[PDB]
C-alpha cells in the first residue's frame, strides 16, 4: 500500500504545516501537525477542557463506531518550545492520503496549554519519530508509520515541505518526479528517539564551504533551523545590522535587508536554502525589525534541521531494519 496526501502551510510564515487526516467511522477529518520530533497522535477532542478549544476541529469518539477505550491508558507530553497537552486514549481507524491503519492509538486531549488553543488551525499532532518516545502510559503505543510499515510498498515516508506553498506526504514510496538530481542517503542514530544524522557541514551564501560535524535531528515539527551559535554568528555576520536580541528571544535583523542563502552538508552533496526562506518577517506588527529563521540552538541541547532546513529539500525518512535519511534537491 501506500498514501499521499497534501501538507499546507497554516499562515504566510509557513510556521508549521496541516495535514488532512481521516479518524473514525464515518471518517471525522482533523488538520493535524506531522511532526517527525515527536510520536503522539494526538487531537483535540469532545473530552478537551471546553476553554481550551477555540476554533479547532474536535475528535469525537462517541461518533465512531470504530472507536474503542484503550482502558486505563493515559499520555502527557511537553514539547521543545514548552507547550504540552494531556489526556486519555482511544484506538481508532486513521487514514492519511489513501493509506489506512486499523487499530491506531488516537490519544484524545482533556488538557492543552495556550499555544495550542491559541492556534485554531492545528487540531492535533502526528508523530512520525520512532515509537520508543511514544508517552503513553503504562502500555507504549505505536505511530501510524510504524503500525503502517509492514503494508507499505516500501517501508519509508517523504516530506516535501513548500516554501510559502501546499507540499506532500508520501508513505511506502518515492516519487522520482519530486526532486531533481540524485538523493543522497545518511546515517541516523535512534538513541534518543530521533532522526538524528550528522551533517557534513555549511557556507554562508556565495562564501566557502566548512567541513564540519553538525549532529542534529530533521524535525519537521520545528519552524526554525537550529545550529551551534559559532554557525549561527557567522551567518547572521554577513547581514547588516542583524544582532542577537535577548528581549526578543532570538537573532533579528532590518526588514530592509537581502538575506544570503545557507548551505547544509549531507555528505558529499549540499541543499541550499534560499536567503527568502530566513526570513520571517516583522517581530510585531509593523516593526522593521524582522526574525531570523536561523537561531542558536545553545539553549536547547541539540541541533534541529526544521522546517527552514527541510522545505529546501526533499526527504526521505527511510524506515528499514537500519533506518536512514535522505536529502535531495528540488
Known sequence: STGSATTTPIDSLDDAYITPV??????????LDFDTGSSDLWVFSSETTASEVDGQTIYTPSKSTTAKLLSGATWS?????????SGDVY??????????????????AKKVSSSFTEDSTIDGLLGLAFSTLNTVSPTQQKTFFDNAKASLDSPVFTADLGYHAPGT?????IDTTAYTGSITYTAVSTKQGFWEWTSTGYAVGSGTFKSTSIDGIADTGTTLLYLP????????????????????????????????????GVGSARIVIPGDYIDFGPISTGSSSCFGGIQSSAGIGINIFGDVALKAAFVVFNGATTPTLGFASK
Open 22 to 31: 481521516q479518524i473514525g467511522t464515518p471518517a471525522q477529518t482533523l488538520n
Open 229 to 264: 551559535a559559532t554557525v549561527v554568528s557567522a551567518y547572521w555576520a554577513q547581514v547588516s545590522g542583524a544582532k542577537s536580541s535577548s528581549s526578543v528571544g532570538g537573532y533579528v535583523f532590518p526588514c530592509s535587508a537581502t538575506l544570503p542563502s545557507f548551505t547544509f
Open 77 to 85: 507530553i511537553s514539547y521543545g518550545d514548552g507547550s504540552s497537552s
Open 91 to 108: 484506538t481508532d481507524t486513521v487514514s492519511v492520503g489513501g493509506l489506512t491503519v486499523t487499530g491506531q492509538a488516537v490519544e484524545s
Open 169 to 173: 506526504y508520501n508513505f511506502g514510496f
